[PDB]
Design a protein around this ligand. Sequence first.
Ligand SMILES: Nc1ncnc2c1ncn2[C@@H]1O[C@H](COP(=O)(O)OP(=O)(O)O)[C@@H](O)[C@H]1O
Lengths: 57, 57, 124, 68, 63, 120
Amino acid sequence: ENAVTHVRGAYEALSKYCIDLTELAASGKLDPVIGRDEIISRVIRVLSRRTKNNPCL
Amino acid sequence: ENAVTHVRGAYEALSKYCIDLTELAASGKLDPVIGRDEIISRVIRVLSRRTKNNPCL
Amino acid sequence: SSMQFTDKATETLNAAAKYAAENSHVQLHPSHVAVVMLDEENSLFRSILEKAGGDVVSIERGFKKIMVRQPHSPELAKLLHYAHEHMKKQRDLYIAQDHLILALADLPSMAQVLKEGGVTKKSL
Amino acid sequence: WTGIPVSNLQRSEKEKLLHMEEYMKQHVVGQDEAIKAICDAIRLSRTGLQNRNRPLASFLFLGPTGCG
Amino acid sequence: FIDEIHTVLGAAIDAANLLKPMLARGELRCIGATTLTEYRQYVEKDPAFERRFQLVMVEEPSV
Amino acid sequence: MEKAHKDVSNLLLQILDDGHCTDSKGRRVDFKNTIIVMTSNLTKNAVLATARRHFANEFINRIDELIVFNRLTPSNIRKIVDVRLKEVQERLDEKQITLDVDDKAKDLLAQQGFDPVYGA
Ligand SMILES: Nc1ncnc2c1ncn2[C@@H]1O[C@H](COP(=O)(O)OP(=O)(O)O)[C@@H](O)[C@H]1O
């Protein structure tokens, strides 16, 4: 009984130090982006290459 | 009998940790100040204020 | 358990230990806490009883009779257990003076004074 | 107690080092010139051709990853 | 997504040494986002950084 | 074995010479039966020359074999995706389940899941 009182009264470091962007999009808390169709399709093509596989905005 | 002991052990904290400067001046055991007529009287003209009533030499 | 205290709570428990020296006592009974709070003018324990509708005279007589029948008491360890539960109920983090007052209605030997004085547990 | 069958322990020491280069090529296919070089340092230090003051073998995997 | 990459590549402190084997071997990829003024003084001045980061231009909206 | 200073580099040098290290408690663990392998990333002639300049001079030459993994041959990628799917078939033979894969799905699991400079 005293153990649960002192405490109360993988993905651990990614939720405390960083902010998951997919969590806000899957919950309806992220603003949509309309007009960047010529940039999103280019980032995917960069990650599927050998030389220069890191896009830099 | 157990109540008069804790009381004994005017003011107590002012006679055991601070030296009263006005006591030595009333008995003549304090040297006078000659020449500071424009500085000593200036402190009196500051304590009678509403804001910044703490003059610092 | 993390039973942290505030600045105002330490001024009451420390004064309750020295208050029993004049009344000829050799132990720290939890009944001495309510006596010290009622002896101070415009205290926190007195303002609570005025809003809940309770006679402060009948309550003081209840805790006074328990002190006479008395010869750190083990009862104090049980009082701090129920007082820590009120800290999480009010959505607070520290333990103030009002948190120690709500624990008096949980003990079977201390809730009788609140009933005869007109203090309801649901209204407190 | 462990799990490895008895047939994998009753093999001769002089016969396991000969077929060692052929067993590693079953799952890893592509590095025909790298697996053969692995047995060159193990079979040399077990036949008295290397000083006993040195360990078994000292390797250094370089190049791109994902090969095996 | 690394916002303002010129700080992590050598401002907090220099952390580009621990991220070079990750970006080269493909173990941990990242997306850069910095200013063109700061992109020259931290990427184009290093031959090892230019061969791994590709120039991605962002169009600015008009009317 | 490249994200460190020179403290652990000099300690591993005595293992390849004396064959045992000095323990803090006072032991001499003989490393005569423990193989030492490393993993780094520093055609194949210009790759091994880079790692020789990063470490010490009296350490990169005492290595037995400097096996440098080259690029993946495209003709051998098809033979890799065929032996890996066999393990899935072994877990379904006890339930009388025949997992068949056509020639179209084998090409997608080879040109996408494998790449020379990206990793498996
Ligand atoms: N022939 C193969 N068939 C299937 N998977 C392989 C093959 N060769 C390598 N892999 C996979 O590639 C991965 C390489 O991991 P690796 O980069 O060595 O990890 P680490 O960097 O932690 O040592 C392994 O997890 C392994 O499952």
